[PDB]
Design a protein around this ligand. Structure first.
Ligand code: MHI
Ligand code: MG
Length: 494
């Protein structure tokens, strides 16, 4: 028996596909479910549930043919109807999926989600059981990548109506991906087995994947040294076994611009300019992460061949003396003799505590500001963050497709990925313009203009750009970790 041993670190938020919208949920979900496409070894979308597609001359209407003999774990056929149902479901305002904006690529999607349009004016329709037609608002070169995103995964319509909570346990789960969910001990472990109903089961070489939920990267490393894990993190305080692989996105902090004292732009800028991202990566993380002096990470090539982040340059760098000046100026503007109490809230986990402590110490040392730390587990932390309950909070962004607009759309007014209360009409206009811009050089210019404005008003503090550095059992081969998107294990062997 070949059993791959990995660590998920924590409990998935949700296995209802559009709901989790995070690594902890979607790393495992990506291996028990499947979209129309799946990203391959070269990170390009390849036929998965769709065996092929046709695109109209105007580049807006995609017609997908569903694989013959694609089946759910319960033996039901995977139909075009399951995709139509799932996509209209994810857009349903009553559902409140944070990922619903990803459905706005579909004509009528934004209108439906916003209550200004009808469900059946969302332009996704099953023409027959094996034919799915979708019309986009505008051409989208990354659409075939987007439909590998878990938000776009099908749901078995029959199963969903019979039991609307099917996704909540292994016993009731019905999936269509390379592995079958066979055990889910909440907060302890996940087990999945090679799925004997899967269309491409002959490709799948592993018998089982077991997912631990060990949140201490030190205990992780110990489990790797003892042989209990096939893959593991590299501990900061340590330094052929090691695999360095890119991952777009960043670690950052959010302010709430409607909670004192962060209504004042100078106070926000002061805090942002106090943080020294190089010190964080050099003295805390220590996994060769790039310090983040902007929001959009490395990895996005421009029309001119340059990297977007390289071309844009640093937008925010530590400047202690200027920070002190701006804090003084902002406090005077608000008639503050002393700053109101500030709490920095992070999600309960050793790395987040160690970074929050560094930020706490730096703010004290640079500005003389005392912040108190608070923490809660990710699942409720995320709910509270979305609800705008935190003054100042640990934040993470992974792009959903491989373009800077994935990052920049986050900070539109009221966006599910904003969570700061920041509401800049000029920013909103730049994003709208970029979303409607067919000329790529122009579109890139608009995106740099937007990013400069975002960083200038400092509703956020960028900290560091991600990567995926791991130890791996040399007897495991063929794990595919993508720069944008979730781990693929279907090709792996041991
Ligand atoms: C997926 C969606 N676009 C998005 O960004 N969701 C974020 C959550 C994004 C998210 O799961 N981060 C991960 C990133 C892990 C990066 C990895 N190298 C590491 O260092 O372990 C996390 O913090 O564990 C949201 O809802 O707040
Ligand atoms: Mg609404």
């Amino acid at each position: 028996e070949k059993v791959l041993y990995v660590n998920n670190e924590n409990e998935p938020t949700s296995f209802d596909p559009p709901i989790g919208f995070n690594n902890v949920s979607w790393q495992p979900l990506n291996n028990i479910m499947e979209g129309l496409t799946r990203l391959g070894k070269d990170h390009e979308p390849e036929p998965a549930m769709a065996e092929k597609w046709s695109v109209s001359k105007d580049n807006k209407t995609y017609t997908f043919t569903i694989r013959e003999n694609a089946k759910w774990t319960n033996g039901d056929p995977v139909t075009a109807g399951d995709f139509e149902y799932a996509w209209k479901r994810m857009l349903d305002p009553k559902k409140g999926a944070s990922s619903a904006f990803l459905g706005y690529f579909i004509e009528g999607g934004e209108a439906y989600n916003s209550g200004k349009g009808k469900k059946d004016d969302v332009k996704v329709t099953a023409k027959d059981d094996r034919t799915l037609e979708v019309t986009l608002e505008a051409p989208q070169k990354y659409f075939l990548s987007v439909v590998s995103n878990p938000a776009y995964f099908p749901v078995n319509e029959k199963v969903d109506k019979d039991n609307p909570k099917w996704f909540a346990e292994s016993d009731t789960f019905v999936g269509n991906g390379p592995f079958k969910l066979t055990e889910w001990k909440h907060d302890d472990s996940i087990t999945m087995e090679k799925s004997d109903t899967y269309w491409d089961k002959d490709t799948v070489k592993l018998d089982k994947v077991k997912w631990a939920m060990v949140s201490d990267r030190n205990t992780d490393y110990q489990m790797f040294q003892s042989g209990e894990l096939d893959t593991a993190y590299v501990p900061a305080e340590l330094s052929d076994n090691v695999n360095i692989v890119d991952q777009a996105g960043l670690y950052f902090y959010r302010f709430n611009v409607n909670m004192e004292p962060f209504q004042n732009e100078n106070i926000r800028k002061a805090f942002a300019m106090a943080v020294d991202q190089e010190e964080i990566v050099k003295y805390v993380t220590k996994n060769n992460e790039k310090p983040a002096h902007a929001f959009v990470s490395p990895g996005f090539t421009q029309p001119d061949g340059k990297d977007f982040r390289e071309a844009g340059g640093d937008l925010i760098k530590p400047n202690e003396s200027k920070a002190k000046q701006l804090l003084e100026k902002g406090m005077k503007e608000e008639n503050y003799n002393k700053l109101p109490a500030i709490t920095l809230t992070y999600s309960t986990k050793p790395e987040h505590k160690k970074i929050a402590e560094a930020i706490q110490q730096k703010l004290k040392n640079s500005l003389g500001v005392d912040v108190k730390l608070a923490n809660m587990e990710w699942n409720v932390f995320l709910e509270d963050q979305k609800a705008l309950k935190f003054q100042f909070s640990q934040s993470s962004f992974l792009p959903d497709y491989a373009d800077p607009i994935s990052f920049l759309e986050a900070f539109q007014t009221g966006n599910s990925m904003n969570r700061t209360g920041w509401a800049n009409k000029e920013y909103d206009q730049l994003i709208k313009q970029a979303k409607n811009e067919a000329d790529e050089k122009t579109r890139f210019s608009l995106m740099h203009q937007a990013e400069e404005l975002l960083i200038n008003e400092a509703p956020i503090i960028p900290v560091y750009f991600y990567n995926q550095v791991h130890l791996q059992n040399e007897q495991v081969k063929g794990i595919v970790r993508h720069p944008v998107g979730y781990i693929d294990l279907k090709w792996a062997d041991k």
